[PDB]
Amino acid sequence: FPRVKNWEVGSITYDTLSAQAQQDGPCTPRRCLGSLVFPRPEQLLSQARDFINQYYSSIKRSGSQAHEQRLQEVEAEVAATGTYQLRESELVFGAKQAWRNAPRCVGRIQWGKLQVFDARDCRSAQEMFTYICNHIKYATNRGNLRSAITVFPQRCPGRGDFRIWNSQLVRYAGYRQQDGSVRGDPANVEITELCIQHGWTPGNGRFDVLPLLLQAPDEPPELFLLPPELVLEVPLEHPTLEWFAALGLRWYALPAVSNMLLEIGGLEFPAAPFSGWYMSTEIGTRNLCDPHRYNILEDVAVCMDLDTRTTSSLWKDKAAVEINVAVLHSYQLAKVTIVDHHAATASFMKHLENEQKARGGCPADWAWIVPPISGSLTPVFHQEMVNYFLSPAFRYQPDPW
Amino acid sequence: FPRVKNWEVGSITYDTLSAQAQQDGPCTPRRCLGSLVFPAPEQLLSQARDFINQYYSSIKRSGSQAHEQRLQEVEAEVAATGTYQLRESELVFGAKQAWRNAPRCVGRIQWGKLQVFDARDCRSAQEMFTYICNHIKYATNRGNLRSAITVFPQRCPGRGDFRIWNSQLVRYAGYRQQDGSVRGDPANVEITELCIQHGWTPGNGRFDVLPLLLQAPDEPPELFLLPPELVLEVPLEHPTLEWFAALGLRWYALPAVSNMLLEIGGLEFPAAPFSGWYMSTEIGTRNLCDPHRYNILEDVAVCMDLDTRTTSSLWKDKAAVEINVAVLHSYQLAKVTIVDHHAATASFMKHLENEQKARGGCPADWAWIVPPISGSLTPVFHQEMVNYFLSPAFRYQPDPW
Numbered sequence: 001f002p003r004v005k006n007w008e009v010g011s012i013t014y015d016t017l018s019a020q021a022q023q024d025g026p027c028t029p030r031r032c033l034g035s036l037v038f039p040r041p042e043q044l045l046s047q048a049r050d051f052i053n054q055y056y057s058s059i060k061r062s063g064s065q066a067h068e069q070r071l072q073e074v075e076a077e078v079a080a081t082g083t084y085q086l087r088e089s090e091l092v093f094g095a096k097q098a099w100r101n102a103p104r105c106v107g108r109i110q111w112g113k114l115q116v117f118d119a120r121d122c123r124s125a126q127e128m129f130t131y132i133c134n135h136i137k138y139a140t141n142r143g144n145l146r147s148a149i150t151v152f153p154q155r156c157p158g159r160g161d162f163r164i165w166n167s168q169l170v171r172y173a174g175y176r177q178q179d180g181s182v183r184g185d186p187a188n189v190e191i192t193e194l195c196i197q198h199g200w201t202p203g204n205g206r207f208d209v210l211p212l213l214l215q216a217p218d219e220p221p222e223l224f225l226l227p228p229e230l231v232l233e234v235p236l237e238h239p240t241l242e243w244f245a246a247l248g249l250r251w252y253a254l255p256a257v258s259n260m261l262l263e264i265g266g267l268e269f270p271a272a273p274f275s276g277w278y279m280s281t282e283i284g285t286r287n288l289c290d291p292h293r294y295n296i297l298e299d300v301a302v303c304m305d306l307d308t309r310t311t312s313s314l315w316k317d318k319a320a321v322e323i324n325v326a327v328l329h330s331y332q333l334a335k336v337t338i339v340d341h342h343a344a345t346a347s348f349m350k351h352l353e354n355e356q357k358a359r360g361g362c363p364a365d366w367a368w369i370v371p372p373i374s375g376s377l378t379p380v381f382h383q384e385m386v387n388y389f390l391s392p393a394f395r396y397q398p399d400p401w
Numbered sequence: 402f403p404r405v406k407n408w409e410v411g412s413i414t415y416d417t418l419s420a421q422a423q424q425d426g427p428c429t430p431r432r433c434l435g436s437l438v439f440p441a442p443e444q445l446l447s448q449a450r451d452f453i454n455q456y457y458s459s460i461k462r463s464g465s466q467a468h469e470q471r472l473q474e475v476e477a478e479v480a481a482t483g484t485y486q487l488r489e490s491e492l493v494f495g496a497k498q499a500w501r502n503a504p505r506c507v508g509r510i511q512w513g514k515l516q517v518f519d520a521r522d523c524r525s526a527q528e529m530f531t532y533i534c535n536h537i538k539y540a541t542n543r544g545n546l547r548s549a550i551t552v553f554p555q556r557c558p559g560r561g562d563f564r565i566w567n568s569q570l571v572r573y574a575g576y577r578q579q580d581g582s583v584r585g586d587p588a589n590v591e592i593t594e595l596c597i598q599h600g601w602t603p604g605n606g607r608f609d610v611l612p613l614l615l616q617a618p619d620e621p622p623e624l625f626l627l628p629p630e631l632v633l634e635v636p637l638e639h640p641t642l643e644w645f646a647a648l649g650l651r652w653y654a655l656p657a658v659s660n661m662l663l664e665i666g667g668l669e670f671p672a673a674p675f676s677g678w679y680m681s682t683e684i685g686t687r688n689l690c691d692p693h694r695y696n697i698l699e700d701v702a703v704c705m706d707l708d709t710r711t712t713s714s715l716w717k718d719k720a721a722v723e724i725n726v727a728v729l730h731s732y733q734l735a736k737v738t739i740v741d742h743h744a745a746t747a748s749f750m751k752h753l754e755n756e757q758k759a760r761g762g763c764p765a766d767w768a769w770i771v772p773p774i775s776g777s778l779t780p781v782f783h784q785e786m787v788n789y790f791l792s793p794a795f796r797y798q799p800d801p802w
């Protein structure tokens with residue numbers, strides 16, 4: 001039972017939950033690969049039994065009448081057809097636990113309040129689009145954001161797969177130039193090459209919302225324009241640097257991840273888009289300042305008349321904080337839910353203490369929980385953490401091409 | 402071999418050196434513990450065998466007459482005496498390799514320019530003190546700092562260890578104040594308690610330099626005062642915040658770690674203090690802002706007339722950036738060597754590139770290489786890293802008391 005210490009306060013806990021870790025990670029006694037982003041058939045019954053055991057233990061109903069009984073139906077379901085369907089409440093519970101079990105997510109203090117839309121009866125790419133648009137409108141909620149996931153039909157043999165080709169539901173275009181370099185978001189250059197390839201005509205701007213590329217089984221992808229008034233966006237202004245707004249920067253409101261594979265009870269949902277709300281450093285520091293992203297940092301520092309001539313002026317650090325201040329200010333003035341990295345990490349500490357008494361520990365990936373600016377100024381920095389894989393879970397998956 | 406990617410640039414290397422990892426660390430496929438701070442004749446022979454191999458590799462005489470002769474010499478000496486002695490050239494090579502191999506050190510681009518003082522003929526605590534003072538004088542060099550290590554006699558059978566009780570050669574006292582607070586540095590309350598118990602008359606300021614407690618074999622530790630003019634200090638001022646000088650803050654020029662064990666070819670040196678120069682964030686973020694250290698952040702932010710009632714004003718990040726500006730400015734003004742986290746991480750990337758061509762990889766602890774502020778503004782952030790333990794090496798050891 002690994003001993004975990006908080007070096008800021010002196011407390012010591014022991015992670016007994018790590019004992020249940022199923023799928024194995026990348027690290028070995030010889031070498032640690034914690035920093036890697038992508039870590040390097042009746043088996044279905046075993047994962048089905050375990051998940052059903054979780055559910056009934058969580059409702060204080062372990063080893064009961066209905067517990068035995070539901071063990072039977074799944075045993076018989078797979079016996080007959082080689083797979084099973086989840087009860088409605090089980091799909092809800094599996095979704096919530098998969099969020100609870102996500103080691104890189106700092107927002108898990110919210111894990112209990114998740115809205116699970118059931119799209120398991122989907123059938124076409126036009127159907128997907130209306131399922132996706134009800135999600136986006138419900139999650140957006142005119143700016144008072146609400147966690148939500150939509151669960152499209154699971155995977156089965158013989159049939160293709162439901163897949164969303166965009167990494168997120170809302171993404172900005174990436175256009176190459178007569179010199180390679182990009183107008184718009186360089187992260188999405190590839191999918192923009194496909195959106196054009198499948199019919200979309202590119203805009204000219206740095207903030208053109210990409211069209212969705214939705215894929216019903218076996219039939220190829222199909223483009224879908226997003227409705228403008230459905231995509232809530234925030235123009236960025238600074239509370240006191242009056243020139244900042246003229247930089248023309250905007251970002252959108254809803255972070256909606258649409259390429260991960262929800263895995264519950266041995267079933268695999270390759271299309272299960274989830275959305276919460278942003279931590280402000282995701283926008284200000286990662287999306288806007290990463291050198292391979294919008295890379296605005298030097299442009300903001302010139303407008304502040306900082307000494308960009310030497311690193312020891314900390315010009316990068318100063319411009320980055322102001323970029324973040326403007327993000328916080330703009331989202332608040334637009335009445336759109338956002339949380340700063342100090343509030344977020346403080347709630348995660350609260351989550352760790354809750355998870356300690358409830359389950360005897362919590363899987364956490366230090367390198368992703370600690371924010372990318374001002375790390376040691378947040379209480380998670382001095383907190384040791386254990387990283388392991390519990391189930392249900394969200395996993396990465398190959399691109400559908 | 403683990404595939405390692407730099408996400409900023411898209412480079413891809415394969416760390417083949419990790420396969421020679423001469424010991425095992427805390428992680429398993431079940432659980433990563435990378436964030437934890439603290440993770441016989443024939444085996445002495447096999448460690449010695451591998452180091453002699455390393456040494457004769459670095460002087461391009463592998464498998465020569467002089468190489469085989471040296472293996473024969475060492476085995477015969479372990480047979481006659483249970484141990485063996487390093488040649489001077491082997492000691493200099495082994496001390497440089499230990500630095501080169503230290504996975505949490507961002508300043509390793511310097512690893513080859515290290516001044517090695519051989520004090521293995523040291524006799525008493527009093528001589529120990531003389532060697533130390535000359536180390537401090539050579540490394541400080543009136544503010545133009547140089548990298549140095551002084552090596553005291555090795556652990557050997559029949560006699561106790563030389564030990565430096567102090568964690569660093571220069572530390573500020575930490576006195577438990579009356580009500581319950583700490584005046585001075587709180588990390589040093591224990592060593593301060595010991596120094597008093599051993600006859601030190603205690604000051605009562607915030608920046609009182611601690612005496613050294615030096616332990617000769619099978620002797621109690623002995624108290625030595627450092628000559629005031631040996632300890633170069635830097636008063637802290639801010640280039641444009643003139644009330645900052647009124648805080649009375651100071652820091653010392655020389656970081657000299659004195660409580661780690663140096664391991665070379667199976668031999669162990671429990672006393673081998675080493676010194677470099679500071680990276681500014683150790684002083685500004687860690688030493689002054691850590692809430693369990695001097696904890697000046699709120700006092701600074703209040704003086705800046707920031708709004709410290711809501712965290713979304715990023716007052717913490719603003720105040721910390723200005724504390725780092727003052728450290729860099731104060732050290733430059735005093736003509737004392739110092740490096741900022743942007744220049745340091747930039748040279749570490751060159752080190753990674755140099756090391757990949759030389760040994761085919763480089764052990765690095767990502768959570769320690771990334772600075773505690775502005776992490777993703779530095780190029781080491783988006784570089785994946787492999788952590789593992791090579792020897793020669795510096796190791797932690799228990800406190801002698």
Ligand code: HEM
Pocket residue numbers: 099102104105106107108110114147148149274275276277278279282339344368394
């Ligand atoms: C509601 C507030 C939420 C906040 C503030 C939040 C914040 C974050 C942040 C900052 C990251 C790390 C990104 C990075 O460091 O690059 C992350 C990752 C993640 N989030 Fe959350 N999140 C929230 C809700 C959710 C929800 C509702 C789900 C799923 C139902 C979820 C699932 C995940 C997963 C699986 C990851 C890890 C992705 C990966 O491993 O690549 N989060 N989140």
Ligand code: HEM
Pocket residue numbers: 500503505506507508509511515548549550675676677678679680683687740745769770795
């Ligand atoms: C000359 C400039 C140097 C710089 C700028 C530097 C910088 C650093 C920093 C910033 C850390 C980690 C501290 C933290 O993250 O809180 C570190 C760790 C370390 N450094 Fe260096 N260092 C230098 C020289 C040296 C030398 C000369 C040696 C030994 C010969 C050395 C050996 C180590 C070791 C062993 C660690 C790990 C400490 C631990 O495991 O707790 N460094 N260094």
Ligand SMILES: Cc1cc(N)nc2cc(-c3ccc4c(c3)[C@@H](N)CCCC4)ccc12
Pocket residue numbers: 255257274275276277278279282
């Ligand atoms: C639900 C949610 C909320 C939020 N507020 N943020 C989130 C960020 C990610 C995320 C996951 C993986 C990757 C990224 C983001 C990338 N943006 C950074 C590394 C590449 C892989 C995923 C989900 C998030």
Ligand SMILES: Cc1cc(N)nc2cc(-c3ccc4c(c3)[C@@H](N)CCCC4)ccc12
Pocket residue numbers: 035036037187367368408782783784785
């Ligand atoms: C060590 C590390 C820690 C962390 N906390 N975050 C990290 C995020 C990336 C990363 C950054 C940007 C992008 C990606 C990964 C790609 N996965 C997605 C496409 C390009 C955008 C890489 C390394 C990271």
Ligand SMILES: Cc1cc(N)nc2cc(-c3ccc4c(c3)[C@@H](N)CCCC4)ccc12
Pocket residue numbers: 438656658675676677678679680683
């Ligand atoms: C040579 C050197 C130079 C420098 N410029 N800095 C250095 C910082 C450390 C260091 C050593 C041990 C510990 C720390 C720092 C602390 N950060 C806490 C971790 C374990 C104890 C060690 C050596 C350093």
Ligand SMILES: Cc1cc(N)nc2cc(-c3ccc4c(c3)[C@@H](N)CCCC4)ccc12
Pocket residue numbers: 007008366381382383384436437438588693768769770
């Ligand atoms: C996860 C992690 C990463 C990192 N990069 N650094 C870390 C430094 C400490 C740490 C903080 C304060 C103190 C210590 C360690 C102890 N070593 C004693 C020295 C002062 C108190 C704890 C955790 C750290």
Ligand SMILES: [Ca+2]
Pocket residue numbers: 305306307
């Ligand atoms: Ca200028």
Ligand SMILES: [Cl-]
Pocket residue numbers: 255282287
């Ligand atoms: Cl994003």
Ligand SMILES: [Cl-]
Pocket residue numbers: 656683688
């Ligand atoms: Cl220090």
Ligand SMILES: [Gd]
Pocket residue numbers: 641642643
């Ligand atoms: Gd001023």
Ligand SMILES: [Zn+2]
Pocket residue numbers: 286290777783
């Ligand atoms: Zn980034």
Ligand SMILES: [Zn+2]
Pocket residue numbers: 027031032033034428432433434435
């Ligand atoms: Zn690991």
Ligand SMILES: [Zn+2]
Pocket residue numbers: 376382686687691
């Ligand atoms: Zn700290």
